[PDB]
Amino acid sequence: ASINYDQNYQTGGQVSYSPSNTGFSVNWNTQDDFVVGVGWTTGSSAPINFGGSFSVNSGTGLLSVYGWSTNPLVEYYIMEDNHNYPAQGTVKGTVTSDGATYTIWENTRVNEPSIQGTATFNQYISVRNSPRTSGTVTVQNHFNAWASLGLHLGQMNYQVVAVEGWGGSGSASQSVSN
Amino acid sequence: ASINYDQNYQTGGQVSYSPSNTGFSVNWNTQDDFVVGVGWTTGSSAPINFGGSFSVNSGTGLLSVYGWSTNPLVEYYIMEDNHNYPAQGTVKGTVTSDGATYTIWENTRVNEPSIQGTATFNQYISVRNSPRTSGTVTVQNHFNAWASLGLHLGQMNYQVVAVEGWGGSGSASQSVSN
Ligand SMILES: [Ca+2]
Ligand SMILES: [Ca+2]
Protein backbone atom coordinates (compact mmCIF):
# COMPACT_ATOMS: atom_id res chain seq x y z
CA ALA A 1 0.00 0.00 0.00
CA SER A 2 2.32 2.69 1.42
CA ILE A 3 2.93 3.30 5.10
CA ASN A 4 0.73 6.20 6.17
CA TYR A 5 0.63 5.61 9.92
CA ASP A 6 3.25 5.86 12.64
CA GLN A 7 2.52 4.13 15.93
CA ASN A 8 4.44 5.99 18.61
CA TYR A 9 3.42 5.19 22.17
CA GLN A 10 5.70 5.27 25.20
CA THR A 11 5.43 6.00 28.93
CA GLY A 12 9.01 6.35 30.17
CA GLY A 13 12.65 5.33 30.15
CA GLN A 14 15.09 5.14 27.27
CA VAL A 15 13.20 4.50 24.00
CA SER A 16 14.90 5.58 20.76
CA TYR A 17 12.36 5.18 17.96
CA SER A 18 13.26 6.00 14.35
CA PRO A 19 10.37 5.68 11.84
CA SER A 20 11.00 5.61 8.10
CA ASN A 21 9.25 5.22 4.78
CA THR A 22 9.88 1.47 4.61
CA GLY A 23 10.04 0.54 8.28
CA PHE A 24 11.37 1.51 11.67
CA SER A 25 14.14 1.12 14.19
CA VAL A 26 14.05 1.01 17.99
CA ASN A 27 16.56 0.75 20.81
CA TRP A 28 15.21 0.65 24.34
CA ASN A 29 16.14 0.33 28.02
CA THR A 30 12.98 0.95 30.01
CA GLN A 31 10.73 -0.31 32.81
CA ASP A 32 7.70 1.23 31.11
CA ASP A 33 5.52 -0.06 28.29
CA PHE A 34 5.78 1.40 24.80
CA VAL A 35 4.26 0.44 21.45
CA VAL A 36 6.06 1.71 18.33
CA GLY A 37 5.88 0.71 14.69
CA VAL A 38 4.59 1.70 11.27
CA GLY A 39 1.67 0.69 9.09
CA TRP A 40 -1.70 1.94 7.87
CA THR A 41 -4.47 4.26 9.03
CA THR A 42 -7.12 1.68 8.08
CA GLY A 43 -6.17 -2.00 8.12
CA SER A 44 -7.08 -4.47 5.41
CA SER A 45 -6.88 -8.14 4.42
CA ALA A 46 -3.58 -7.64 2.60
CA PRO A 47 -0.82 -10.05 3.70
CA ILE A 48 1.71 -8.04 5.72
CA ASN A 49 5.45 -8.49 5.13
CA PHE A 50 7.99 -7.83 7.89
CA GLY A 51 11.68 -8.57 8.27
CA GLY A 52 14.83 -7.59 10.06
CA SER A 53 16.13 -8.06 13.55
CA PHE A 54 14.53 -8.09 16.99
CA SER A 55 16.71 -8.66 20.03
CA VAL A 56 15.50 -8.67 23.65
CA ASN A 57 18.43 -8.49 26.08
CA SER A 58 16.12 -8.65 29.11
CA GLY A 59 12.50 -8.06 30.12
CA THR A 60 9.38 -8.47 27.96
CA GLY A 61 9.59 -8.00 24.18
CA LEU A 62 6.99 -8.65 21.46
CA LEU A 63 7.18 -8.42 17.65
CA SER A 64 3.70 -8.47 16.14
CA VAL A 65 1.11 -7.17 13.73
CA TYR A 66 -0.92 -4.94 16.07
CA GLY A 67 -4.19 -3.11 15.54
CA TRP A 68 -7.61 -1.90 16.63
CA SER A 69 -11.24 -2.25 15.62
CA THR A 70 -14.35 -0.22 16.45
CA ASN A 71 -17.94 -1.24 17.22
CA PRO A 72 -17.00 -3.48 18.94
CA LEU A 73 -13.76 -1.96 20.30
CA VAL A 74 -11.03 -4.60 19.85
CA GLU A 75 -7.26 -4.60 20.31
CA TYR A 76 -5.61 -7.44 18.45
CA TYR A 77 -2.14 -8.94 18.17
CA ILE A 78 -0.59 -11.52 15.87
CA MET A 79 2.67 -12.19 17.67
CA GLU A 80 5.41 -13.52 15.44
CA ASP A 81 7.83 -13.36 18.31
CA ASN A 82 7.73 -12.81 22.06
CA HIS A 83 10.00 -13.07 25.11
CA ASN A 84 9.03 -13.15 28.77
CA TYR A 85 5.44 -12.40 27.80
CA PRO A 86 2.95 -12.99 30.69
CA ALA A 87 0.39 -14.98 28.69
CA GLN A 88 -2.83 -13.38 29.93
CA GLY A 89 -6.39 -14.49 29.34
CA THR A 90 -8.12 -17.55 27.97
CA VAL A 91 -6.90 -19.92 25.25
CA LYS A 92 -9.57 -20.40 22.58
CA GLY A 93 -7.93 -22.69 20.05
CA THR A 94 -5.44 -22.63 17.20
CA VAL A 95 -4.90 -21.69 13.57
CA THR A 96 -2.17 -22.87 11.26
CA SER A 97 -0.94 -20.01 9.13
CA ASP A 98 2.22 -19.02 7.30
CA GLY A 99 4.49 -21.90 8.29
CA ALA A 100 3.34 -22.45 11.88
CA THR A 101 0.48 -22.88 14.33
CA TYR A 102 -0.79 -20.06 16.57
CA THR A 103 -2.50 -20.39 19.94
CA ILE A 104 -5.47 -18.04 20.06
CA TRP A 105 -6.29 -16.18 23.28
CA GLU A 106 -9.05 -13.80 24.33
CA ASN A 107 -8.47 -11.31 27.11
CA THR A 108 -10.20 -8.30 28.59
CA ARG A 109 -8.69 -4.94 29.48
CA VAL A 110 -10.78 -3.04 32.05
CA ASN A 111 -10.49 0.77 32.14
CA GLU A 112 -7.46 0.71 29.87
CA PRO A 113 -6.29 3.38 27.42
CA SER A 114 -7.64 3.00 23.89
CA ILE A 115 -8.26 4.84 20.63
CA GLN A 116 -11.63 5.77 22.18
CA GLY A 117 -10.12 7.04 25.42
CA THR A 118 -9.81 4.88 28.54
CA ALA A 119 -12.23 2.00 28.06
CA THR A 120 -12.95 -1.68 28.67
CA PHE A 121 -12.52 -3.94 25.67
CA ASN A 122 -11.40 -7.40 24.58
CA GLN A 123 -8.13 -8.54 23.00
CA TYR A 124 -7.83 -11.17 20.26
CA ILE A 125 -4.31 -12.57 20.30
CA SER A 126 -2.63 -15.07 17.99
CA VAL A 127 0.74 -16.21 19.37
CA ARG A 128 3.00 -18.01 16.89
CA ASN A 129 4.29 -21.33 18.26
CA SER A 130 7.51 -21.01 16.26
CA PRO A 131 8.85 -17.43 16.75
CA ARG A 132 10.40 -15.61 13.78
CA THR A 133 11.65 -12.14 12.89
CA SER A 134 11.04 -12.33 9.11
CA GLY A 135 7.97 -13.34 7.11
CA THR A 136 4.48 -12.70 5.79
CA VAL A 137 1.34 -12.66 7.90
CA THR A 138 -1.85 -13.56 6.01
CA VAL A 139 -4.12 -11.52 8.31
CA GLN A 140 -7.39 -12.97 6.93
CA ASN A 141 -6.54 -16.44 8.21
CA HIS A 142 -6.44 -14.95 11.72
CA PHE A 143 -9.63 -12.94 11.28
CA ASN A 144 -11.43 -16.07 10.00
CA ALA A 145 -10.10 -18.24 12.85
CA TRP A 146 -11.02 -15.54 15.37
CA ALA A 147 -14.56 -15.21 14.01
CA SER A 148 -15.08 -19.00 14.03
CA LEU A 149 -14.24 -19.13 17.74
CA GLY A 150 -16.60 -16.28 18.57
CA LEU A 151 -13.96 -13.54 18.50
CA HIS A 152 -16.05 -10.91 16.71
CA LEU A 153 -14.38 -7.87 15.01
CA GLY A 154 -15.89 -4.52 13.99
CA GLN A 155 -14.79 -1.70 11.65
CA MET A 156 -11.06 -1.75 10.88
CA ASN A 157 -9.01 1.05 12.41
CA TYR A 158 -5.20 1.33 12.29
CA GLN A 159 -2.96 -1.69 11.68
CA VAL A 160 0.79 -1.62 12.23
CA VAL A 161 3.77 -3.90 12.71
CA ALA A 162 4.88 -3.00 16.23
CA VAL A 163 7.48 -3.77 18.88
CA GLU A 164 6.30 -3.55 22.48
CA GLY A 165 8.26 -3.95 25.67
CA TRP A 166 9.08 -3.18 29.28
CA GLY A 167 11.35 -4.30 32.11
CA GLY A 168 14.58 -4.28 30.13
CA SER A 169 16.55 -3.48 27.00
CA GLY A 170 16.73 -4.59 23.38
CA SER A 171 16.68 -3.38 19.79
CA ALA A 172 14.83 -3.96 16.50
CA SER A 173 15.19 -2.91 12.85
CA GLN A 174 12.18 -3.94 10.82
CA SER A 175 11.03 -3.49 7.22
CA VAL A 176 7.23 -3.18 6.80
CA SER A 177 4.95 -3.50 3.72
CA ASN A 178 1.87 -5.03 2.06
CA ALA B 1 3.15 17.80 57.94
CA SER B 2 3.64 20.02 54.86
CA ILE B 3 2.81 19.01 51.31
CA ASN B 4 6.02 17.88 49.65
CA TYR B 5 4.59 15.82 46.79
CA ASP B 6 2.64 16.72 43.68
CA GLN B 7 0.77 13.93 41.93
CA ASN B 8 0.49 14.92 38.28
CA TYR B 9 -0.54 12.13 35.93
CA GLN B 10 -2.54 12.56 32.73
CA THR B 11 -2.82 10.88 29.32
CA GLY B 12 -4.81 13.27 27.16
CA GLY B 13 -7.60 15.78 26.67
CA GLN B 14 -8.30 19.00 28.52
CA VAL B 15 -6.90 18.79 32.09
CA SER B 16 -6.10 22.07 33.85
CA TYR B 17 -4.28 21.21 37.08
CA SER B 18 -3.15 23.93 39.49
CA PRO B 19 -1.16 22.69 42.52
CA SER B 20 -0.55 24.91 45.53
CA ASN B 21 0.99 24.93 48.98
CA THR B 22 -2.29 24.07 50.71
CA GLY B 23 -4.10 22.11 48.02
CA PHE B 24 -4.97 21.96 44.35
CA SER B 25 -7.46 22.83 41.67
CA VAL B 26 -8.53 20.94 38.55
CA ASN B 27 -10.85 21.51 35.62
CA TRP B 28 -11.15 18.74 33.06
CA ASN B 29 -12.90 17.64 29.87
CA THR B 30 -11.23 14.43 28.75
CA GLN B 31 -11.76 10.84 27.59
CA ASP B 32 -8.43 9.82 29.11
CA ASP B 33 -7.51 8.91 32.69
CA PHE B 34 -5.56 11.32 34.86
CA VAL B 35 -4.59 11.31 38.54
CA VAL B 36 -3.72 14.69 40.08
CA GLY B 37 -3.44 15.87 43.66
CA VAL B 38 -1.03 16.82 46.43
CA GLY B 39 0.34 15.14 49.52
CA TRP B 40 3.49 13.51 50.87
CA THR B 41 6.54 11.65 49.55
CA THR B 42 6.18 9.00 52.28
CA GLY B 43 2.72 8.33 53.70
CA SER B 44 1.99 7.92 57.39
CA SER B 45 -0.78 7.13 59.88
CA ALA B 46 -1.68 10.80 60.30
CA PRO B 47 -5.39 11.56 59.76
CA ILE B 48 -5.72 13.39 56.44
CA ASN B 49 -7.94 16.47 56.13
CA PHE B 50 -9.54 17.45 52.82
CA GLY B 51 -12.24 19.92 51.85
CA GLY B 52 -13.66 21.97 49.04
CA SER B 53 -15.67 21.18 45.97
CA PHE B 54 -15.75 18.28 43.52
CA SER B 55 -18.21 18.38 40.65
CA VAL B 56 -18.53 15.72 37.93
CA ASN B 57 -20.63 16.97 35.02
CA SER B 58 -20.32 13.66 33.16
CA GLY B 59 -18.16 10.53 33.00
CA THR B 60 -16.21 8.91 35.86
CA GLY B 61 -14.93 11.02 38.76
CA LEU B 62 -13.31 9.98 42.06
CA LEU B 63 -12.20 12.01 45.10
CA SER B 64 -9.94 9.92 47.34
CA VAL B 65 -6.85 9.49 49.45
CA TYR B 66 -4.61 7.65 46.98
CA GLY B 67 -1.23 5.99 47.45
CA TRP B 68 1.29 3.23 46.88
CA SER B 69 3.26 0.67 48.88
CA THR B 70 6.34 -1.41 48.06
CA ASN B 71 7.27 -5.01 48.87
CA PRO B 72 4.51 -5.93 48.21
CA LEU B 73 3.60 -3.41 45.48
CA VAL B 74 0.14 -2.04 46.37
CA GLU B 75 -2.04 0.75 44.96
CA TYR B 76 -4.69 1.84 47.41
CA TYR B 77 -7.70 4.15 47.42
CA ILE B 78 -9.97 5.46 50.14
CA MET B 79 -12.75 6.96 48.07
CA GLU B 80 -14.70 9.68 49.83
CA ASP B 81 -16.66 10.31 46.69
CA ASN B 82 -17.17 8.69 43.30
CA HIS B 83 -19.44 8.97 40.25
CA ASN B 84 -19.96 6.45 37.47
CA TYR B 85 -17.15 4.34 38.90
CA PRO B 86 -17.05 0.78 37.41
CA ALA B 87 -16.70 -1.10 40.72
CA GLN B 88 -14.02 -3.61 39.79
CA GLY B 89 -12.81 -6.60 41.76
CA THR B 90 -13.93 -8.51 44.82
CA VAL B 91 -15.74 -7.18 47.89
CA LYS B 92 -13.96 -8.23 51.08
CA GLY B 93 -15.99 -6.62 53.84
CA THR B 94 -16.53 -3.28 55.53
CA VAL B 95 -15.09 -0.79 58.00
CA THR B 96 -16.89 2.01 59.77
CA SER B 97 -14.71 5.08 59.89
CA ASP B 98 -15.15 8.83 60.11
CA GLY B 99 -18.94 9.07 60.01
CA ALA B 100 -19.72 6.26 57.57
CA THR B 101 -19.16 2.67 56.47
CA TYR B 102 -16.84 1.70 53.61
CA THR B 103 -17.08 -1.36 51.39
CA ILE B 104 -13.63 -2.88 50.99
CA TRP B 105 -12.57 -4.33 47.62
CA GLU B 106 -9.46 -6.10 46.38
CA ASN B 107 -8.54 -5.98 42.71
CA THR B 108 -5.61 -6.89 40.52
CA ARG B 109 -4.00 -4.82 37.79
CA VAL B 110 -2.04 -6.95 35.30
CA ASN B 111 0.81 -5.31 33.36
CA GLU B 112 -0.28 -1.85 34.48
CA PRO B 113 1.87 1.25 34.98
CA SER B 114 3.25 1.68 38.49
CA ILE B 115 5.93 3.42 40.54
CA GLN B 116 8.08 0.37 39.70
CA GLY B 117 7.40 0.55 35.98
CA THR B 118 4.67 -1.49 34.28
CA ALA B 119 3.83 -4.31 36.69
CA THR B 120 1.13 -6.58 38.09
CA PHE B 121 -0.09 -5.70 41.56
CA ASN B 122 -3.16 -5.62 43.79
CA GLN B 123 -5.42 -2.72 44.78
CA TYR B 124 -6.94 -2.22 48.23
CA ILE B 125 -9.97 0.02 47.91
CA SER B 126 -12.25 1.49 50.58
CA VAL B 127 -15.36 3.08 49.04
CA ARG B 128 -17.36 5.35 51.36
CA ASN B 129 -21.06 4.46 51.41
CA SER B 130 -22.02 8.08 52.09
CA PRO B 131 -20.03 10.30 49.63
CA ARG B 132 -18.62 13.62 50.86
CA THR B 133 -16.30 16.36 49.65
CA SER B 134 -15.10 17.58 53.08
CA GLY B 135 -13.70 15.68 56.06
CA THR B 136 -10.94 13.77 57.82
CA VAL B 137 -9.77 10.30 56.87
CA THR B 138 -8.25 8.30 59.73
CA VAL B 139 -6.01 6.20 57.46
CA GLN B 140 -5.01 3.69 60.17
CA ASN B 141 -8.59 2.43 60.49
CA HIS B 142 -8.40 1.44 56.82
CA PHE B 143 -4.95 -0.12 57.10
CA ASN B 144 -6.11 -2.15 60.13
CA ALA B 145 -9.33 -3.26 58.39
CA TRP B 146 -7.37 -4.14 55.26
CA ALA B 147 -4.81 -6.19 57.21
CA SER B 148 -7.54 -8.07 59.10
CA LEU B 149 -9.11 -9.19 55.81
CA GLY B 150 -5.78 -10.36 54.41
CA LEU B 151 -5.02 -7.17 52.48
CA HIS B 152 -1.31 -6.98 53.31
CA LEU B 153 0.66 -3.69 52.87
CA GLY B 154 4.41 -3.13 52.57
CA GLN B 155 6.69 -0.07 52.92
CA MET B 156 4.84 3.24 52.59
CA ASN B 157 5.54 5.23 49.44
CA TYR B 158 3.72 8.42 48.38
CA GLN B 159 0.27 9.33 49.70
CA VAL B 160 -1.86 12.08 48.19
CA VAL B 161 -5.43 13.35 48.06
CA ALA B 162 -6.26 12.93 44.38
CA VAL B 163 -8.99 13.46 41.81
CA GLU B 164 -9.15 10.91 39.00
CA GLY B 165 -11.39 10.82 35.97
CA TRP B 166 -12.19 10.08 32.35
CA GLY B 167 -15.08 10.13 29.88
CA GLY B 168 -16.28 13.63 30.67
CA SER B 169 -15.88 16.97 32.40
CA GLY B 170 -15.88 18.39 35.92
CA SER B 171 -13.92 20.50 38.38
CA ALA B 172 -12.49 20.34 41.91
CA SER B 173 -10.87 22.75 44.40
CA GLN B 174 -9.51 20.90 47.40
CA SER B 175 -7.56 21.86 50.53
CA VAL B 176 -5.14 19.14 51.76
CA SER B 177 -3.33 18.65 55.12
CA ASN B 178 -2.42 16.39 58.06
CA1 LIG C 1 13.24 -13.93 19.18
CA1 LIG D 1 -20.29 13.99 44.77
Swiss-Prot record, chains A, B:
GO terms for molecular function: endo-1,4-beta-xylanase activity. This is Endo-1,4-beta-xylanase 1. One of its GO terms (biological process) is xylan catabolic process. Glycoside hydrolase involved in the hydrolysis of xylan, a major plant cell wall hemicellulose made up of 1,4-beta-linked D-xylopyranose residues. Catalyzes the endohydrolysis of the main-chain 1,4-beta-glycosidic bonds connecting the xylose subunits yielding various xylooligosaccharides and xylose. The catalysis proceeds by a double-displacement reaction mechanism with a putative covalent glycosyl-enzyme intermediate, with retention of the anomeric configuration. Its EC number is 3.2.1.8. Optimum pH is 3.5-4.0. Stable from pH 2.5 to 8.5 at room temperature and from pH 2.5 to 4.5 at 40 degrees Celsius. Belongs to the glycosyl hydrolase 11 (cellulase G) family. Substrate binds at Y66, Y77, R109, P113, Q123, Y158. The keyword Signal applies. The active site is at E75 (nucleophile), E164 (proton donor). Pathway: Glycan degradation; xylan degradation. The chain holds residues 52 to 229 of 229 of the full protein. Disulfide bonds: none annotated. It catalyses: Endohydrolysis of (1->4)-beta-D-xylosidic linkages in xylans. Its main location: secreted. Keywords: Carbohydrate metabolism, Glycoprotein, Glycosidase, Hydrolase, Polysaccharide degradation, Secreted, Signal, Xylan degradation.
